[PDB]
Write a protein that binds this ligand. Structure first.
Ligand SMILES: CC(C)CN(C[C@@H](O)[C@H](Cc1ccccc1)NC(=O)O[C@H]1CO[C@H]2OCC[C@H]21)S(=O)(=O)c1ccc(N)cc1
Lengths: 99, 99
């Protein structure tokens, strides 16, 4: 699909058996999700944004289905104000900016 | 241009007679720039992102040239770690996500 930006480019995704919505964020190097029940081991991680830093848990090789497109990559889980699909996963679906 | 996302989608822009680099950020509703003494009046504003909120100065109807494309819109000035072109200006150059 081609997505214009008059509204937030929020898409439907499937992750860890749960249904969720996430923001296609080209400004996000990596994917981050609000608190959620993922399986497996994880490592504490500290990320940064406009307002400062938050502590999150990094999970690797996580299967996501982004708007019917499957991808496997790192997914951080922590106190983000919204679920964000970062460039680490956008590249796998072949996402591009156009103008 | 069509921009892939293996690298940060950073473009060269002209603002207030100054040259700067900024991130094409579909996750940003509005444009935010590091400190710069733009001319004119402004109104205090508080925005929020990952890690909390920051206080910024809001200027309206500011001319930016994004990759040689002129646009006029709101530009926030404050302690952001990186210049971000938000959706308020991306729509004016017709920027879209494609995959
Ligand atoms: C919560 C986000 C969806 C909103 N943000 C845009 C987003 O692209 C920021 C923009 C951004 C970019 C660099 C530094 C700070 C903020 N990226 C970001 O927070 O990235 C962090 C979370 O995922 C990781 O990816 C790399 C950094 C981590 S935001 O910078 O806070 C923002 C909010 C409101 C406006 N008007 C403009 C920008």
């Amino acid at each position: 699909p081609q997505i214009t930006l008059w509204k937030r480019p929020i898409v439907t995704i499937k992750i860890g058996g749960q249904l969720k919505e996430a923001l296609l964020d080209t400004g996000a190097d990596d994917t981050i999700f609000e608190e959620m029940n993922l399986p497996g081991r994880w490592k504490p991680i500290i990320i940064g944004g406009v307002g400062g830093f938050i502590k999150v848990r990094q999970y690797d090789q996580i299967l996501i289905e982004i708007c019917g497109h499957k991808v496997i990559g790192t997914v951080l889980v922590g106190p983000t104000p919204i679920n964000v699909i970062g460039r680490n996963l956008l590249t796998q679906i072949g996402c591009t900016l156009n103008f």
